[PDB]
């Protein structure tokens, strides 16, 4: 199977309330293991997984220094971006940052990425070639100019092809029992009449990993998109996730509708009928 590691960085300015609020979280696929908070009393990188507490002091304090370098970076990025859009200092703004690498079944380098976003909208992102960039607006073109003239994209590809992938292999070994697991979703459907001639058919999928899953409804072969009530994949809090879809059907023709669950943990795509 394929695995991934991602780091997420969020900085929100506080006009007239001091420093900006910085938060950083690291992930291995859909499993969190590190995290930092600017308002926490610890003021250092904290573990958020049992298999990551095995690290020594060099690893712990070494990442606290790098998350502080990322925090002060966004602190300066807010003032620079504020001038790119001619904004005042009385408004709060958000800069978002994420990068990481992917590995396949053989745990070889799949794809590396690094993207920025200012106030929700995309700003700049490293392409798949890991050497050229993609500027969203003209304000991002200014950032592209400074980073291509300094040739700073090659050191990024050096980190995405080495330190990221090589240390991603380590976590998959130290947390082998928790990371290289694939739990099949527990599927079922519920029936509840909402009106005299209407009923709600909710297709369920519980306790699955990873979180990516596809639950779809079909009526005798044709798929439903406008009537299907889909909610985002929610986590149960124990590592596994949940998801349900629903369609309101006239009472009496429920035998025509069928739910289809697609998940990698399933040996074959299963179908629930009536």
């Amino acid at each position: 199977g394929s695995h991934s590691m991602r780091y997420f960085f969020t900085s929100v300015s506080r006009p007239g309330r001091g420093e900006p609020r910085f938060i950083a979280v690291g992930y291995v696929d859909d499993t969190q293991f590190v995290r930092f908070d600017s308002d926490a009393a610890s003021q250092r990188m904290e573990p958020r997984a049992p298999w990551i507490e095995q690290e020594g002091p060099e690893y712990w304090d070494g990442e606290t220094r790098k998350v502080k370098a990322h925090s002060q970076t966004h602190r300066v990025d807010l003032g620079t971006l504020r001038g790119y859009y001619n904004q005042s200092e009385a408004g709060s703004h958000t800069v978002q940052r994420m990068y990481g690498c992917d590995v396949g079944s053989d745990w070889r380098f799949l794809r590396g990425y690094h993207q920025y976003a200012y106030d929700g909208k995309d700003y700049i992102a490293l392409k798949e070639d890991l050497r050229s960039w993609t500027a969203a607006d003209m304000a991002a073109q200014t950032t592209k100019h400074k980073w291509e003239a300094a040739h700073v994209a090659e050191q990024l590809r050096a980190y995405l092809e080495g330190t990221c992938v090589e240390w991603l292999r380590r976590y998959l070994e130290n947390g082998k029992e928790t990371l290289q697991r694939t739990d099949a979703p527990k599927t079922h459907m519920t029936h509840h009449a909402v009106s005299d001639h209407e009923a709600t058919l909710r297709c369920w999928a519980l306790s699955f990993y990873p979180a990516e899953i596809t639950l779809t409804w079909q009526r005798d072969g044709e798929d439903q998109t406008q009537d299907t009530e889909l909610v985002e994949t929610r986590p149960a809090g124990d590592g596994t996730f949940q998801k349900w879809a629903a369609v309101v059907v006239p009472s009496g023709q429920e035998q025509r509708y069928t739910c289809h669950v697609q998940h990698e943990g399933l040996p074959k795509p299963l179908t629930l009928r009536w």
Partner: peptide, 10 residues
């Protein structure tokens, strides 16, 4: 691990 270097400034 995280990145030790940087991309520069915006």
């Amino acid at each position: 691990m995280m990145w030790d270097r940087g991309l520069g400034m915006m």
